[PDB]
């Protein structure tokens, strides 16, 4: 074995990565970059070995020869005697969320409203919704569909960044890392909870984990699920309890990627690392938990039960599924 160098995106992932590094006895060390794309560049250069990516990034990195190693696997919906590591991943539900009190709003009245996206180029917050929107409007002007948005990663002086808030000091407005207040699943849902935006494009799981006391964070601790509605593609609205019949698409689970070169070694170390810091892991909660960071989803989504092995040694296209792959392809024609 040698060490595995993980790539942390932003200072909060860096700090968490260093805690992990320390606990692993340098078996895992850290490289840090300002963006996911930058981390994908470090891995390509061979300065970093791997990182966990959202589907939209798995596509980007895949075009560059990086490969899926293990996928995030969460609380299995069905009953499974199968170990978490061996269980097939189910994929998460991408949804569009609005305030119940925002009464006139349906999927069909989204034009000129304010939007909250996890980040440009991501599955639930971006590829799915804009793909859908571009298709339905028959126009590639997705930068002008919404009057204003927070879409971390877009031009900071553009409308797509208008609603973004930057860090503590108001710096880094719209950067695609956790320093941006409205970045990622939780940040985009916060953007909605605080009424900065009219709709948030996140995943089903995010609504639940930040409402009804599930989150103690100050902005979320008082949020209640009844106050939110999901927007279905048929123009109707439903309670956040009906994501199964009111989502925009099913999305491929985030997955760890690495140089094909190091795929095997990276997989080795992570299986061992989660046996140590995963859910029910030997040293979690006692010394360190790889899948916790207080609803901030650093390095891995906090709801991750384990990293699962991938059946069929899949290519990035097979991992993502041909439907999602063409979906992304078409949307990129637009740029």
């Amino acid at each position: 074995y040698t060490r595995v160098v993980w790539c942390a995106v932003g200072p909060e992932e860096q700090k968490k990565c260093q805690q992990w590094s320390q606990q692993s006895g340098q078996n895992v060390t850290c490289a840090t970059a300002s963006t996911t794309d930058d981390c994908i560049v470090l891995v390509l250069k061979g300065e970093a070995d791997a990182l966990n990516l959202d589907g939209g990034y798995i596509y980007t990195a895949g075009k560059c020869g990086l490969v899926p190693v293990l996928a995030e696997n969460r609380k299995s919906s069905k009953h499974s005697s199968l170990d978490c590591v061996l269980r097939p991943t189910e994929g998460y539900l991408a949804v569009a969320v609005v305030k119940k009190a925002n009464e006139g709003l349906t999927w069909n009245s989204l034009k000129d409203k304010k939007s909250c996206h996890t980040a440009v180029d991501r599955t639930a917050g971006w590829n799915i919704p804009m793909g859908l929107i571009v298709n339905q409007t028959g126009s590639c002007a997705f930068d002008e569909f919404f009057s204003q948005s927070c879409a971390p990663g877009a031009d900071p002086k553009s409308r797509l960044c208008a609603l973004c808030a930057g860090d503590d000091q108001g710096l880094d407005k719209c950067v695609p890392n956790s320093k941006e207040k409205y970045y990622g699943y939780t940040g985009a849902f916060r953007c909605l909870a605080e009424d900065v935006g009219d709709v948030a494009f996140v995943k089903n799981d995010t609504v639940w984990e930040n409402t009804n006391g599930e989150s103690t964070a100050d902005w979320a601790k008082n949020l209640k699920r009844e106050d939110f509605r999901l927007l279905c593609l048929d123009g109707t609205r439903k309670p956040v309890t009906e994501a199964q019949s009111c989502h925009l698409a099913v999305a491929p689970n985030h997955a760890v990627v690495s140089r094909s070169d190091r795929a095997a070694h990276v997989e080795q170390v992570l299986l061992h690392q989660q046996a140590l810091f995963g859910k029910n892991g030997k040293n979690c909660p006692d010394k360190f938990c790889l899948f916790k960071s207080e609803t901030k989803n650093l390095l891995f989504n906090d709801n991750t039960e384990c990293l699962a092995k991938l059946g069929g040694r899949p290519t990035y296209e097979e991992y993502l599924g041909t439907e999602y792959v063409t979906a992304i392809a078409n949307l990129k024609k637009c740029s």
Binding site: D37, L44, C64
Partner: peptide, 6 residues
């Protein structure tokens, strides 16, 4: 749909 975008 081919070249690595970097």
């Amino acid at each position: 749909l081919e070249a690595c975008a970097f």
